[PDB]
Every structure is written in structure tokens, then in C-alpha cells.
Amino acid sequence: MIIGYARVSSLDQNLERQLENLKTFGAEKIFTEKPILQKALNFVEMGDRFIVESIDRLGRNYNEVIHTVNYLKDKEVQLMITSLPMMNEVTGNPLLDKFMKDLIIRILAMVSEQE
Amino acid sequence: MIIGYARVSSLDQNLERQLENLKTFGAEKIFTEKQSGKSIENRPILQKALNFVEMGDRFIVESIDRLGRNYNEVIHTVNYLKDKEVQLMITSLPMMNEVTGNPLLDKFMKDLIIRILAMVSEQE
Amino acid sequence: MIIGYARVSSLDQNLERQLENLKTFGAEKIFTEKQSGKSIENRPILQKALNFVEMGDRFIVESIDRLGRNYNEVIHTVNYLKDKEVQLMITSLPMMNEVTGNPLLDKFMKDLIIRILAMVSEQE
Amino acid sequence: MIIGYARVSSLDQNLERQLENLKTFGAEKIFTEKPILQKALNFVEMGDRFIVESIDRLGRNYNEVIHTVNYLKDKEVQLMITSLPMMNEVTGNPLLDKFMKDLIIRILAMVSEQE
């Protein structure tokens, strides 16, 4: 199935749009956090899709973010970013696709951190 | 219309595959050249191909390396095609020109891919 | 000679730091602008700065985002500087223009970095 | 210290240049292979430098190559490629440096594989 994750840290953020975004792309359940992430990650099983609106939601730590993406990779859970649909197949050569996946994810992690 | 460009260094390279690839992705005409991808000054067929295409046409190759093995040249060629508003397609990269929602990311992707491949092709 | 360009959206941004950065990396003159990095048409100071620099000069900013928050524009500006043969430097990227042996890789690096940062700056 | 690794698979390759290359940049010892790699990796300790002439030497498998680079990272051994000196600091912002390290390494791994 399709699992969703949403985070906002402070007491003034447009959480609705986010949750509605996760809903938009097919999130049947959504883990919202203001360990919830842990729950989210331990919940997902092989064959599921794990979705966020953006990597910054997932974290703002290069190392950790990468570690988490690798965790999902290990568990064979499809990671998707609602702001990066089609991110999987940019070209049609799965190898290049994988490489680009990595790049994008890393550019984004770095951005998320540096902010 | 759809123009294709095909290049091989020798004849033991499977040129048929390449031509059939260009035909499949819609080549109405194919400019075929037996030559090194090291420069364009020694590639008048490429020149003909490029001068032939006009705004609204599609230009198709099997790989960037087919187009050349020189970063600056390849880049300049890609930009040349962009300026003339000719669609560059790479049949091994079928989903590259697919508008997938966010133009910024898309263009960024293109530039990136093309440059990586340009360098790859050159360094070899 | 070394020309610097400095931009801030408001005055609560630490403009002194930026100016001192440009001064340190050798700004003889600094074109200072209070404006959004969303476009150049509303940035005549940038225009003056760009027209001022000539072949042999250095153009220095603290960050690409200072230069703008528009991919195409930034890229076009970088290429503009390249065409006029003016050295673009980013003081936060001091070792970027350092010739480190392999020109191909170097140029590839530049293009890449600059484009990543262009997009970053835009998307924000 | 500085450890070197060199590989050639077949019976007709310019091994001299390679070994001399590893020698050039300061290789005190060189592991040459036609498990030797295992030896090379288990040999290096914290603080050492591990050097190859090129990533393809190190392998032609995206996954494995990456895994190995991560292994060296874990062990805090500096990886260097004699054809990519200065690769560490392209800009002067260590974060971006790390990111670029990753990129380059991956472009190269992909190239090494696809050939």
C-alpha cells in the first residue's frame, strides 16, 4: 500500500496542504509529527511506498537523511517525493535513473541541511 | 519532421542496430557517417544534418557519444539545436524530454545529464 | 581589476559581512544593491556592474544567490561573463577557479556547481 | 602512511605506468592484483591514505564500488585517485566538497560498470 509521513516543528505551519498533498498521491495512512518517524519506517514493509512532500520534511541532516533513504532501500520500500513525481525514470536507462535518484536526493539533503 | 544522425568509427560496429533504433524512434531521414567522434570539422555530414534541421524538426541520435567525443563541441551543438528550436532526442534516453511537472528541475536534469555524458564520451 | 557585486533584500541582512568579504577577496569597487534577486530587469546596478567589467577584470560575489534567484538568468549571466572573458569568482567558493590539472573535469565541475546553485537559489 | 592498489585482469596491460603512478604520489607499499584487494583494505588503518589510479581499477560494479568507498569512510581512511588529485576540495565549503566527492565517485562507478 502507500504510507505517508508529515512533519512540522513549530506552531505556525501550513500542515493542511501537506497532509492533503500526501492524501493527493494516495496516502492511506499518514504519520504526522510536530519517534513518529521511527513508527513510520518500522511500519512499512516490502512492496509498500513511503512518501513525503519533500526531503526537508524527512530531515535536515545529510548523513541521517542518506542513512534513512538507504534504510528504505534495504527494506525494498519505494521512496517517493510528491514534489518529485516521475523522479524514478528521468531517461529510461535504470542505471542512470538510480544514479540520478542518488544525486537529486543528495542535492536536496545538502540543501535541507544548509538551511 | 524527425531527422536522425548515425555515426560509426568502423564497420564492425553494429550500424544496423543504430539505424534501426533511429528508424524506430521515427527517423524519416538518417545522416549516416563513418568517422571519428573527435571533432566536427572533419564531419561535414553532421554539418549537413545540422543545417538541414529547422525550427519544428526533431534531431535524434542513439547516444551523445554518436554526436561526438568532445565536451565543448557537444555542448555547443546541443545549444545550437536549442537556439534553432530543434528537439534533440537520444533514443537510449527516451524519457528525457518528457515534461514531468516542474520545468526548473527538468531543464536542470537535461543540462546535467547531457554534460555528464558529454564528458564521459570525451574522456573515452 | 577586481569588481565586486553585493545585493541585499533588506537592511537587517548582514550587508557589512558581505561587503567585507568582497573587500577581502580584493574588491576595488563594489556595486551595492538593495533589491530582490528575482530578476535583472529590476536591477540596473547589476547592469552597470556587468557593463563596467571588461576582458581581464574579475567579477566577485559572495554567493550565486546574490547574483540572482533565477536559473536561466544566472546561467545567462555566467555565460555573459565568460564571453567577455571576465573571471567570475564566488568568495564562498574560493577554490573553484583553481586549475587543478585536468581542464575537462574542471570545466565540468564549474558548470555543475554553478547550475546546482542556480537552481537552489531559484527554488528558494 | 600511504598505501597503493593496482589491478590488471588480462595478460596485456601497461601495469608499469600504473605502479609508477601509485609510486609517484607516495605509495610506500602497493598491492598488485591480476583477495589482494581484501588484504589491501584490511591492511589500511585509521589515518592512512588509500590510493588508486582510477575507480575502474577499484572495481566495475556500482554497488560494490560504493560499498567499498563507504568501507574506507567507516575506517576513516582517506581515499585518493591519482587521476583526481585535489578532488577533495573543489570549492572550499567542506559540505559541497563531500557532496561532489560522492557525485564524482558515482559518475565514475557508473562509467566503470557500463563499460
Domain map of chain D by residue range? 2-115
A chain contacts of residue C116, beta-carbon cutoff 8 Å:
107
Please give the residue of chain B at the shortest CA–CA distance from D110: B120
From the CA of D2, how many Å to the nearest CA of chain C?
21
CATH assignment of D2-115? 3.40.50.1390
How many CB atoms sit inside 10 A of residue C69's CB? 20
Alpha-carbon distances, residue B77 vs B83, B105, C80, C84, C98 (angstroms)? 10, 22, 18, 21, 27
Residues D40-78, buried b or exposed e (16+ Cβ, 10 A)? bbeebeeebbbbbbbbbbbbbebeebbebbeebeeeebe
Mutate to test the interface with A, among B98, B104, B110, B117 (most CBs of A within 10 A): B98
Put simply, the answer to whether A100 touches B92 (Cβ < 8 Å) is: no
Instruction: Tell me the HSE value of A100 on the side-chain side, using a 13 A CA sphere.
Output: 25
Put simply, the answer to whether B123 touches C112 (Cβ < 8 Å) is: no
Bridge partners, B49 (sequence order):
none
Residues A81-92, buried b or exposed e (16+ Cβ, 10 A)? bbbbeebebbbe
Least Cα distance to B116 among B65, B61, B66 occurs for B65
CA triple A96-D55-B93, angle to 5 deg = 15
Structural method: X-ray
Kindly give, in sequence order, each residue whose CB lies less than 8 Å from that of residue A59, ignoring residues fewer than 6 positions away: A65, A68, A109, A112
Alpha-carbon distances, residue A16 vs A22, A24, A86, C123 (angstroms)? 10, 12, 24, 22
**Exposed/middle/buried for residue B93 (C-beta within 10 Å: 0-12, 13-18, 19+):** buried
DSSP state of D76: T
Put simply, the answer to whether C115 touches B119 (Cβ < 8 Å) is: no
Expressed in angstroms, the distance from the first to the final Cα of chain D is 33
Q: Would you list which residues of chain A are within 8 Å, Cβ to Cβ, of chain B?
A: 83-86, 89-93, 96, 100, 103
CA dist., res. C112 & res. D95, Å (int): 15
Q: Would you list which residues of chain D are within 8 Å, Cβ to Cβ, of chain A?
A: 62, 95-96, 98-99, 102-103, 106-107, 110, 113-114
Secondary-structure percent of chain C, ordered helix, strand, coil, rounded to 5: 45, 15, 35
Please give the residue of chain B at the shortest CA–CA distance from C105: B119
* Amino acid in the structure at residue C95: M
From the CA of A25, how many Å to the nearest CA of chain D?
30
Q: Would you list which residues of chain D are within 8 Å, Cβ to Cβ, of chain B?
A: 107, 111
| φ, ψ (nearest 5 deg) of residue A47 | 95, -15
Bridge partners, A62 (sequence order):
none
For residue A112, indicate whether it is catalytic: no
A chain contacts of residue B96, beta-carbon cutoff 8 Å:
90-92
Please report the number of interchain residue pairs, chain A to chain B, with beta-carbon separation below 8 angstroms.
32
Q: Which CATH class is domain B2-124?
A: alpha beta
DSSP state of B84: T
CA dist., res. C51 & res. C45, Å (int): 10
Resolution (A): 2.7
* Catalytic residue annotation of B: 9
Three-state DSSP class for C75?
helix
Cell readout for B100 is: 514531468
Least Cα distance to A103 among A78, A69, A57, A77 occurs for A69
Q: Would you list which residues of chain B are within 8 Å, Cβ to Cβ, of chain D?
A: 116, 120
From the CA of A51, how many Å to the nearest CA of chain D?
24
From the CA of A64, how many Å to the nearest CA of chain C?
21
Kindly give, in sequence order, each residue whose CB lies less than 8 Å from that of residue B107, ignoring residues fewer than 6 positions away: C71, C72
Please give the residue of chain A at the shortest CA–CA distance from C121: A111
From the CA of D75, how many Å to the nearest CA of chain B?
30
Bridge partners, B30 (sequence order):
B4
Nearest to D103 among A62, A95, A103 (CB): A103
- Report the greatest alpha carbon distance in chain D: 44
